[PDB]
Design a protein around this ligand. Structure first.
Ligand SMILES: *[C@@H]1O[C@H](CO)[C@@H](O[C@@H]2O[C@H](CO)[C@@H](O)[C@H](O)[C@H]2NC(C)=O)[C@H](O)[C@H]1NC(C)=O
Ligand SMILES: *[C@@H]1O[C@H](CO)[C@@H](O[C@@H]2O[C@H](CO)[C@@H](O)[C@H](O)[C@H]2NC(C)=O)[C@H](O)[C@H]1NC(C)=O
Ligand SMILES: *[C@@H]1O[C@H](CO)[C@@H](O)[C@H](O)[C@H]1NC(C)=O
Ligand SMILES: *[C@@H]1O[C@H](CO)[C@@H](O)[C@H](O)[C@H]1NC(C)=O
Ligand SMILES: *[C@@H]1O[C@H](CO)[C@@H](O)[C@H](O)[C@H]1NC(C)=O
Ligand SMILES: *[C@@H]1O[C@H](CO)[C@@H](O)[C@H](O)[C@H]1NC(C)=O
Ligand SMILES: *[C@@H]1O[C@H](CO)[C@@H](O)[C@H](O)[C@H]1NC(C)=O
Ligand SMILES: *[C@@H]1O[C@H](CO)[C@@H](O)[C@H](O)[C@H]1NC(C)=O
Ligand SMILES: *[C@@H]1O[C@H](CO)[C@@H](O)[C@H](O)[C@H]1NC(C)=O
Lengths: 132, 133, 143, 143, 132, 133
């Protein structure tokens, strides 16, 4: 995970980055002790995630910073792709919305109705839990 | 509706014959609920850019289909012009702050509801609103 | 897990002809460590005068590229250099046992009223673990 | 490590008469977990009526004595109870993936103006590691 | 060391204490987040450190917070007594001095003169450095 | 000069016959430069009255001998009455936190300079000044 102190001062043997103009860039711009990595990975940011997956598959990288279930799905696709053990910034994907609008209450209530039953579990059975 | 091509979430795949999706089945025979979205290519001056419609399915697409099944409302899924989520980026003249990506298409009125793998943080919730994750 | 050098006053430190290869070490020029050596061993400074170098990371590169074998400097700075070492290759000798054993501080003018306030504030900052938190933040003693 | 139950959709959760050991599952009374049960499996509530209990620590003692076999509660509270359990003889199933997967929050009055400031302050508390610092302080990650 | 949660949440068999009215009690009384140990160490406060050594040798004490030199010396003397390595509250042993007095500067310069040469090394060779 | 019983710093032993000390030799033949300290047998409940000049030596004793050889003064070595370092503990009248131990003997004029393993912290330096460790 992130608590490897040798990645705090990276070099040409630690080639890792994140997606250009992603949320990872803002999250590493806020935390000041992650500034040095922020001053390294700004030299190698990529336009999309699949380009980074194809780059790290050919060993043109060494690590990659991304969300959990996407990288677990990529590990279920390709066995050489391995997620690390540590975990940080435990947050949530929700629905991006407008300002004051009549789609605030019932959208959240419908998502929560999908949480109370096993419909989110069925959607996990479609793609998230699904191994190959 | 705007979204980005996320490989475990939003599968975007070109059409088979004429603006239509191949009816693919799952392991249980459940038909994959696909939608006719609109997908532009990444480099518009690098190649002849057509902006053809395309097929969108997967995790968040089926979540949106369930949401449209719940409340009576139609939808039009389109995609982002450039593959960025959206960041608080400063423009060159007068050092003014602006937004790009899906948030840049949201605040410009081009979008109405972002159903996409969007990460909740502090700087986004100051300007837009968030449902429960 | 061995000891190449015993301490500051090793028996090898009296003659380079006692060494079978030509031994080399170094410090930083015009430092207080050099003044401590000159007030302890002037002959050690006379051997080191032919073996000077430029700076900290210059000596670090000379240690990595095999141009240098030892480097005498402050304790915690070399502990941090071992913390940022490429795979714990360069290892210090002990933890400050056969050495000068001093500390840092804040230099003030003689008779300044800021002395007692800074003294009590630093002894309060040690007394609540906040200095240990700063040492955890800025000094990572790996391996 | 082995897991005899691999989710809430297990075949053993249908009826303990179906299998040769009749086991017991435990919940807490008057909770939203029971509302999730009664909106998912009313028969699970009907057999929980056979297998009720009173106290969370009392149910912990009943698990330690073997009078109770399975137990159903929230995630982080049972994770903290397993983090301070003597011997770590009580292990959960996974890390919350075949489950409800909700979150704890701050409930306010409907139409209160304090919602936006509390939401911005909590999202500031998440995105700087201070929330993770408090989680490290108030949870034990052993065994 | 101090990072054991068994000492953060003690029991009736993890008997840790300190010398009564020492710097350990002051340092664990200032830190209110270490108040729990402050509730425990009052059970078995002793007078001299040799009483604590005889208690921990006969397994009456299970842990004992103390300065490093005396415990490392007793570990050099007795093989069964084992110290730990988690060092905390790096302090100094200094000569206890008066108020404004004409011995504050001369004695301090003499101690620093003892620091610059190898006289502290000779004092280590008397009792401190030699292992047994 | 006041100190406290710690064996790797101040070895405390009764005398050989009366006042004189054992001429002990180290591993290099060095005679241990001892001092005739004045100490009690035990505390006041344990020992009613047994306070004799005893032999004291070791680490801080040799440090004090080096200081007495460096600067031009003679000295006097005694012991602490109780078995405490000294803390700012409450007294009965006026609910005031008074001192005890080595600091209680220093501030009462019974000592002149504490040469002892004094753990430097804030509260001890809030009243008296220190030296370099
Ligand atoms: C959100 O869903 C609720 C479901 O209760 C809707 O509330 C009902 O809708 C009617 C519409 O005329 C309202 O008059 C009432 O407030 C509700 N029913 C009754 C009779 O209590 C609500 O309209 C939905 N809002 C939208 C459109 O998003
Ligand atoms: C759980 O809820 C029920 C309902 O409040 C409580 O059960 C009894 O409910 C009747 C309703 O008339 C009351 O008269 C009793 O006072 C309730 N029981 C007792 C002994 O107080 C029940 O107590 C609640 N508490 C739990 C945790 O079981
Ligand atoms: C978008 O992508 C393809 C391949 O890059 C490109 O040839 C074309 O301009 C677009 N779509 C079509 C019509 O294939
Ligand atoms: C759909 O819209 C119509 C017309 O407003 C309305 O009658 C109906 O209740 C809505 N809901 C359904 C059933 O989709
Ligand atoms: C502003 O400068 C950036 C490079 O930093 C460039 O990408 C952009 O095209 C410039 N102008 C606009 C349109 O913002
Ligand atoms: C302290 O040292 C200086 C060195 O010359 C000496 O002159 C001075 O008298 C000393 N002070 C005392 C009080 O001994
Ligand atoms: C010291 O201890 C006892 C009191 O506990 C006293 O009666 C006795 O005379 C003393 N013994 C020695 C060692 O002189
Ligand atoms: C020390 O003081 C004594 C007088 O008390 C006298 O021998 C001389 O002034 C001093 N000696 C040395 C060598 O400092
Ligand atoms: C006050 O006096 C009582 C006896 O009445 C004694 O037990 C206690 O130690 C004293 N406390 C203080 C604060 O001196």
């Amino acid at each position: 995970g992130i608590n490897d102190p040798r990645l705090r001062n990276p070099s040409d043997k630690f080639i890792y980055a994140t997606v250009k103009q992603s949320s990872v860039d803002i999250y590493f711009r806020r935390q000041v002790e992650l500034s040095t990595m922020y001053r390294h990975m700004e030299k190698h940011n990529y336009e999309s995630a699949a380009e980074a997956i194809q780059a790290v598959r050919d060993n043109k990288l060494h690590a990659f910073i991304w969300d959990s279930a996407v990288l677990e799905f990529e590990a279920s696709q390709k066995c050489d792709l391995v997620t690390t053990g540590e975990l940080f910034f435990r947050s949530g994907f929700g629905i991006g919305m407008r300002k004051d609008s009549p789609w605030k209450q019932n959208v959240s209530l419908s998502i929560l109705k999908s949480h109370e039953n096993g419909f989110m579990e069925d959607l996990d059975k479609t793609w998230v839990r699904y191994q190959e | 509706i705007v979204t980005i091509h996320q490989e475990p979430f939003v599968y975007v795949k070109p059409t088979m014959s004429d603006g239509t999706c191949k009816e693919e089945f799952t392991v249980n025979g459940d038909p994959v609920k696909k939608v006719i979205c609109t997908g532009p290519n990444d480099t518009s001056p690098g190649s002849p850019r057509h902006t053809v419609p395309q097929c969108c399915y997967g995790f968040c697409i089926d979540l949106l289909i369930k949401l449209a099944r719940t409340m009576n409302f139609t939808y039009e899924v389109h995609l982002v012009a450039d593959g960025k989520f959206g960041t608080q980026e400063r423009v060159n003249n007068s050092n003014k702050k602006e937004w790009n990506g899906m948030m840049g298409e949201l605040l410009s009125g081009q979008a109405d509801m972002i159903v996409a793998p969007l990460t909740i943080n502090n700087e986004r919730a100051q300007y837009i609103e968030f449902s429960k994750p | 897990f061995v000891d190449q050098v015993t301490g500051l006053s090793d028996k090898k430190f009296q003659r380079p002809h006692d060494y079978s290869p030509p031994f080399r070490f170094g410090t930083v020029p015009q430092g207080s460590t050099e003044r401590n050596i000159r007030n302890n061993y002037p002959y050690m400074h006379q051997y080191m005068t032919r073996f000077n170098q430029r700076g900290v990371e210059d000596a670090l590169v000379s240690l990595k590229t095999g141009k240098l074998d030892a480097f005498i400097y402050d304790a915690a700075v070399l502990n941090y250099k071992a913390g940022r070492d490429e795979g714990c290759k360069l290892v210090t000798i002990g933890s400050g046992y056969i050495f000068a054993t001093t500390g840092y501080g804040i230099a003030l003018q003689k008779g300044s009223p800021w002395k007692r306030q800074i003294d009590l504030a630093l002894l309060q900052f040690v007394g609540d673990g906040e200095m240990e938190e700063l040492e955890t933040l800025w000094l990572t003693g790996i391996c | 490590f082995v897991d005899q139950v691999t989710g809430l959709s297990d075949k053993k959760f249908q009826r303990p008469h179906d299998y040769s050991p009749p086991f017991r599952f435990g919940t807490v009374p008057n909770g939203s977990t029971e509302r999730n049960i009664r909106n998912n499996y009313p028969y699970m509530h009907q057999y929980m009526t056979r297998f009720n209990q009173r106290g969370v620590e009392d149910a912990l003692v009943s698990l330690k004595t073997g009078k109770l076999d399975a137990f159903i509660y929230d995630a982080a509270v049972l994770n903290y109870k397993a983090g301070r359990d003597e011997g770590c003889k009580l292990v959960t199933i996974g890390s919350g993936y075949i489950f409800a997967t909700t979150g704890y929050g701050i409930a306010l009055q409907k139409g209160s103006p304090w919602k936006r400031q509390i939401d911005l302050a909590l999202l500031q508390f998440v995105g700087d590691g201070e929330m993770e610092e408090l989680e490290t302080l108030w949870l034990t990650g052993i065994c």
